[PDB]
């Protein structure tokens, strides 16, 4: 069975009690607004034991910014555990997987090769793609004036991501960067057509999050803080 978005995070998905059968969500906003901290929060809620209030499901992290910090995640796990110890932290990290990608072509090849990974790990239900827009400018410049050439590899990546999400009832969280003057979309239409829930992050510590749900067009506002233990919703 698969958990629901309400179970994963009951503060952002209070009205999403339906079990996930392939869901795609985007986190958008400027630098230092807590997108990666939110990813840590969800990762902790998934990989932590059921004894400590977690789901105990595996997570796959694809890092294209190279910004993943193992020490920060470890300290968050230590603070969220009632009885923190090295062995329990090691067990929690045993459900976490990390991949580094250096280019869009490299990312596409990795996505093609992850089919076996998903087949061999039935508990892997969360897929995080941090900065899907990491290679935007380089691909755009290498594509020339033809928009079809600029977006070719990202379009193929989007099709592969859709196939992966549908084939295995996964939840995909993709982080995008505010690189051009609220919300100015720039990624290929193949990616845009897939997004069901979008979230916008803002700074005031004090942080705010605006959730737009395209399934019903509902709009919501939330507030949270970040401390030594990670995210805590107000």
């Amino acid at each position: 069975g698969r958990s629901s978005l309400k179970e994963i995070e009951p503060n952002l998905f209070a009205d999403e009690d339906s079990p996930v059968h392939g869901d795609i969500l985007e986190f958008h906003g400027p630098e230092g607004t807590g997108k990666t901290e939110m990813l840590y929060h969800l990762t902790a809620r998934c990989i932590l034991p059921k004894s400590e209030g977690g789901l105990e499901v595996e997570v796959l992290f694809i890092d294209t910014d190279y910004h993943f910090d193992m020490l920060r995640l470890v300290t968050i796990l230590e603070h969220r555990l009632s009885q923190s110890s090295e062995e329990i932290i090691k067990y929690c990290l045993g459900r976490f997987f990390l991949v580094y990608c250096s280019s869009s072509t490299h990312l596409l090849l990795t996505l093609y090769s992850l089919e076996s990974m998903f087949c061999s790990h039935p508990s892997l239900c969360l897929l995080i793609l941090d900065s899907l827009s990491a290679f935007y400018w380089i691909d755009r410049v290498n594509g020339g004036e033809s928009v079809n050439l600029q977006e070719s590899t990202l379009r193929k990546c989007s099709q592969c991501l859709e196939k992966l999400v549908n084939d295995y009832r996964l939840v995909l969280f993709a982080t995008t960067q505010t690189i051009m003057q609220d919300y100015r979309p720039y990624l290929c239409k193949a990616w845009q057509q897939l997004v069901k829930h979008r979230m916008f992050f803002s700074k005031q510590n004090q942080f705010s999050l605006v959730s737009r749900c395209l399934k019903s067009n509902s709009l919501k506002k939330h507030f949270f803080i970040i401390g030594e233990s990670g995210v805590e919703f107000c």
Binding site: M70, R72, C101, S102, L108, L109, S113, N205
Partner: protein, 308 residues
């Protein structure tokens, strides 16, 4: 990329020519193609195509690493490098971290070069580890380095030995910088087991000095070059596991009156750590964290250039 003889075992000129005649030229086309349709054409064994796809995929594809293993390796391969300044070490929680990108931002004369030289001297003498200093604006001076060293020891021979552990490179444009960084990457690739030398800290003084003149007009070549430089720095930091310090300017917007880095929105995402230096005299600067993954931002304390 392009299919070539010797790219992977099992590739022959005739097979490559048939595939190219059938509009299959790159590894991406091969892996993402319907191998049944290709196999029935060209008179090529389907199993041969399957093996070729598997080999190419296993060769050019990244693979996942379990979190526990990464924790184990980083527990021993990560180091904190004292900057030689007590207050700045207090701000940074014991100082620079290897494996990430640290940016120092400030105005003209704020103390960026002074901090870089203090760290270079402390690494060359206190740690006796090789440093690479990439000077793009003439900031580095050998007499200042020796002056900083003499405040640490009165042994002339030790001062000379420390001065021999610092490599200085001049790169006045983006292409020279990229060439120097790729040369360093290749050198580290050769000296896989090198320990006596094997520079461990890379200082890049005024990344802005080279990046800024690439931005202008409606062309996006400058953005791509800046992002390529960011990729080079990120691979030097994370892949090779060395500390990378980069100096960048500060700017203030006409409407957004706060202080911020100078290379635009895309660059703002690049550094893992950012230290802002401000002035209220010769010394008496204030330092605060403008960006971090391990601490709250906004805490400020004082540093004195004159003393250190």
């Amino acid at each position: 990329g392009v299919l070539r003889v010797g790219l992977c075992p099992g590739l022959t000129e005739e097979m490559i020519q048939l595939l190219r005649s059938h509009r299959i030229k790159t590894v991406v086309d091969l892996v993402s193609a319907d191998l049944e349709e290709v196999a029935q054409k060209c008179g090529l064994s389907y199993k041969a195509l399957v093996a070729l796809r598997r080999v190419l995929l296993a060769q050019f594809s990244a693979f996942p690493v379990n979190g526990a293993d990464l924790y184990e390796e980083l527990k021993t391969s990560t180091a904190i490098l004292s900057t030689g300044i007590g207050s700045l070490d207090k701000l940074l929680d014991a100082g620079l971290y290897t494996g990430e990108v640290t940016e120092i931002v400030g105005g003209p004369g704020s103390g960026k070069t002074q901090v870089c030289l203090c760290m270079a001297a402390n690494v060359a003498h206190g740690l006796q580890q090789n440093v690479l200093y990439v000077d793009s604006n003439g900031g580095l001076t050998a007499s200042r380095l020796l002056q900083l060293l003499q405040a640490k020891t009165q042994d002339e021979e030790e001062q000379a030995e420390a001065l021999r552990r610092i490599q200085v490179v001049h790169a006045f444009d983006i292409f020279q910088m990229l060439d120097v960084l790729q040369e360093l990457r290749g050198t580290v690739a050769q000296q896989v087991t090198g320990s006596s030398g094997t520079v461990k800290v890379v200082v890049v003084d005024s990344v802005t000095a080279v990046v800024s003149p690439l931005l202008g007009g409606q062309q996006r070549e400058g953005l791509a070059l800046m992002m390529q430089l960011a990729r080079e720095l990120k691979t030097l930091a994370r892949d090779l596991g060395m500390a990378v310090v980069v100096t960048n300017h500060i700017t203030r917007d006409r409407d957004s009156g706060r202080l911020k880095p100078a290379l635009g929105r895309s660059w703002s995402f690049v550094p893992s750590t950012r230290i802002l230096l401000d002035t209220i005299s010769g010394g008496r600067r204030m330092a605060c964290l403008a960006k971090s993954s391990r601490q709250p931002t906004g805490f400020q304390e004082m540093v004195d250039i004159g003393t250190w």
